[PDB]
């Protein structure tokens, strides 16, 4: 019933490339057959198998690049997180929590006290 991504994920990139080529050959043969045969739906399964193999190949390649860029700043922009444009432009948590020395001193000296009226 087509390929399974969890099965493809156990294979090396060379095996995946070979399987992709075989699936493309099979799709070509199937669309040759389609001209004569009336209404064969097996083409859809091979198309989805090609899509699955391509997805797994891209997952492996992108994971490899993620490992290559792990930790260092300036990762590729398509590997960076896609929040909104405004969210990416917003101050980090470090910024916007920065306080001046005077402000830090006075907020340590006089924090909002906890109190209750008891009568």
């Amino acid at each position: 019933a087509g390929v399974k991504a969890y099965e493809l994920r156990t294979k090396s990139k060379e095996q995946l490339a070979s399987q992709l080529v075989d699936l493309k050959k099979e799709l070509a043969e199937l669309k040759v057959q389609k001209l004569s045969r009336p209404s064969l739906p097996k083409i859809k399964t091979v198309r989805k198998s090609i899509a699955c193999v391509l997805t797994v190949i891209n997952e492996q390649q992108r994971e490899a690049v993620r490992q290559l860029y792990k930790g260092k700043k300036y990762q590729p922009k398509d590997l960076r997180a896609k929040k909104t444009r405004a969210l990416r432009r917003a101050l980090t948590k470090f910024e916007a929590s920065q306080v001046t020395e005077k402000q830090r001193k006075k907020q340590i000296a006089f924090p909002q006290r906890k109190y209750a009226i008891k009568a």
Binding site: A28, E29, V32, Q33, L35, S36
Partner: protein, 71 residues
């Protein structure tokens, strides 16, 4: 198209609308292991691309078509 295959030694392919004659020639050569004498192309009125690929005299287009599955 089948008459062209039989009599003119010309295979008729639907090809990518982005493919040029060089790409068609090299793809036919790689896919079917044949030498290509000439590639003529047109854009059909339905918006797909049709390539008349005349193989060299060394190869028989009817035999190639039989191999690749349409007689």
């Amino acid at each position: 198209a089948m008459k062209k295959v039989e009599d003119g030694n010309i295979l008729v392919f639907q090809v990518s609308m982005k493919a040029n004659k060089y790409q068609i020639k090299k793809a036919v050569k790689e896919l079917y292991e044949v030498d290509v004498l000439k590639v003529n192309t047109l854009v059909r009125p339905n918006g797909t691309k049709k390539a008349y690929v005349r193989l060299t005299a060394d190869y028989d287009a009817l035999d190639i078509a039989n191999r690749i599955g349409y007689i």
